[PDB]
From a paper:
ACBD3 is a Golgi resident protein involved in the maintenance of the Golgi structure and regulation of intracellular trafficking between the endoplasmic reticulum and the Golgi. However, in enterovirus-infected cells, the ACBD3 GOLD domain interacts preferentially with viral non-structural 3A proteins, which causes re-localization of ACBD3 to the sites of virus replication. In this study, we present a structural, biochemical, and biological characterization of the complexes composed of human ACBD3 and the 3A proteins of four representative enteroviruses. The crystal structures revealed the details of the ACBD3-3A interaction, the 3A-3A interaction causing the assembly of the ACBD3-3A heterotetramers, the interaction between the ACBD3-3A complex and the lipid bilayer, and the roles of these interactions in facilitation of enterovirus replication.
To analyze the dimerization of the GOLD: 3A complexes in more detail, we generated a mutant EVD68 3A protein (hereafter referred to as LVVY mutant) with the following four mutations at the putative dimerization interface: L25A, V29A, V34A, and Y37A. Taking advantage of the vicinity of the C terminus of the ACBD3 GOLD domain and the N terminus of the ordered part of the EVD68 3A protein, we connected the last residue of ACBD3 (R528ACBD3) through a short peptide linker (GSGSG) to the first ordered residue of the EVD68 3A protein (T163A/EVD68). Both GOLD-3A wild-type and LVVY mutant fusion proteins formed crystals, which diffracted to a resolution suitable for further structure determination. The crystal structures of the GOLD: 3A complex consisting of two individual proteins, the GOLD-3A fusion protein, and its LVVY mutant were almost identical with low root-median-square deviations, confirming that neither the fusion-protein approach nor the LVVY mutation affected the correct folding of these proteins. Three lines of evidence document the dimeric state of the wild-type GOLD-3A fusion protein and the monomeric state of its LVVY mutant in vitro. Secondly, the small-angle X-ray scattering (SAXS) profiles of these proteins correspond to the calculated scattering curves of a dimer of the wild-type GOLD-3A fusion protein and of a monomer of its LVVY mutant. Thirdly, crystal contacts corresponding to the 3A dimerization interface are not preserved in the crystal structure of the GOLD-3A LVVY mutant, indicating that this mutant cannot dimerize through this interface even at very high protein concentrations (of approximately 20 mM) present within the protein crystal. Nevertheless, we observed a significant difference in FRET efficiency between the wild-type GOLD-3A fusion protein and its LVVY mutant. Finally, we analyzed the impact of the LVVY mutation on enterovirus replication. Using a reporter subgenomic replicon assay for EVD68 established earlier, we found replication of this mutant significantly attenuated in both U-87 MG and HaCaT cells.
Author numbering:
A (entry chain A): 367 to 436, 473 to 528
B (entry chain B): 17 to 59
Amino acid sequence: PVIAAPSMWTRPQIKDFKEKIQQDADSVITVGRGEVVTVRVPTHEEGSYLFWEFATDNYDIGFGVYFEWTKPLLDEIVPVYRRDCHEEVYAGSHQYPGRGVYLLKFDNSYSLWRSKSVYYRVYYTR
Amino acid sequence: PAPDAINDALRSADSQEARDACQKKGWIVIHPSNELVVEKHIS
């Protein structure tokens, strides 16, 4: 199973991103104290690349990406690491290794006293 | 346009404007958040 390296980057405008994402209730997730939230994104029948964007309001949150092949095989696309996404919008992409499901990991586990608000968005190509 | 190129282009210069442009042209397609299964776990 050859697996392409992901791309990751950031872009400066956080305020505009959040204002745009807030327009959809389901695109804003509350990650509780010590909670890990997993957003599952399936590979698309016509699809090659997946895109993700996310931001938090105040505090950093853990972010990583795993791929679930269709007990099951789990590959690490993006290691989970705390991100500055409260300061800037964090984005990234990956080429489809095969048929399966992407797990977007928002990891608050290290946070004892603080919930996090996660604004996020997902695209894909053809 | 190849997906490789859509990707490398967006990465190179990324903005809401470019997203919308790509979306309008069908190059990228937004995955509705209501279709996405969300899990929660406490460590």
